[PDB]
């Protein structure tokens with residue numbers, strides 16, 4: 001068995017190897033990469049996502065989210081308070097302000113220490129989940145707006161034609177902005193490209209050990225657990241690496257820098273934070289190996305997690321028994 005300790009693997013494809021996306025994913029899995037839940041892909045040195053970022057300031061963040069924390073430093077929830085619209089130029093200036101900017105630090109480890117010590121005492125503003133793309137249309141390799149669609153994968157593997165579309169999302173971050181512990185909708189893959197700015201630190205639990213994280217989360221967030229049988233789908237809960245180590249949960253960490261891709265694999269729980277002003281683009285995707293994870297994915301039926309038009313069809317075809325109750329949650 002390849003990668004039996006479930007370590008995060010890092011790949012350096014040549015420009016020749018960067019032509020066929022599907023084939024490269026299948027290669028990485030042949031080497032055991034999926035066992036970690038997360039992989040890093042460093043693009044060939046010849047590749048570029050676009051020529052410059054010089055003209056992005058006029059993108060609108062229609063609903064910036066203020067991430068307000070509750071709890072203790074290593075075990076907290078966050079709620080998202082909606083703020084007034086602002087441009088990316090306005091948001092970058094805010095991220096660089098004395099109130100919001102990255103503190104002085106020695107290296108990524110000292111910054112990680114400061115994040116876990118102090119996150120709860122601040123409410124950074126996250127421009128998350130913005131439909132759009134920063135890839136130039138002329139970028140032909142690993143262009144997250146040109147991937148094969150999940151609906152087309154389901155049709156190729158299973159023969160069934162379904163409605164829905166699959167488009168990317170932009171994330172504009174600042175110091176302390178946080179992504180809570182989650183897997184993807186329908187336990188899909190994700191791919192995330194850091195277009196510019198400061199780094200993003202990731203934490204991940206190997207898919208084979210995902211239920212260990214769930215059992216810990218039910219113990220740490222006991223009222224949320226009684227409210228919903230899949231409450232990590234609400235994407236609100238944080239648990240620090242120190243608390244994970246104290247409870248014996250297997251995990252890994254890695255820091256992604258500008259110009260790098262990350263792939264998350266089916267049922268790979270992940271969480272993390274931004275080091276400063278940055279912009280990432282991400283999209284979900286599928287392979288043949290995903291289908292079985294999709295059939296088994298948990299679902300939020302309490303009604304909090306409230307998810308896309310395209311997820312309807314996935315539930316309806318892969319989980320027809322749940323269909324019914326899940327759509328009661330989504331209406």
Ligand SMILES: O=C(O)CNC(=O)C(=O)O
Nearest residue numbers: 171179190191192280282
């Ligand atoms: O970048 C972020 O805030 C969150 N991204 C993801 O969870 C992902 O790409 O799967």
Ligand SMILES: [Mg+2]
Nearest residue numbers: 055056058059
């Ligand atoms: Mg612009």
Ligand code: NI
Nearest residue numbers: 183184190264
């Ligand atoms: Ni994710």
Ligand SMILES: [Zn+2]
Nearest residue numbers: 228300302304
């Ligand atoms: Zn729920």
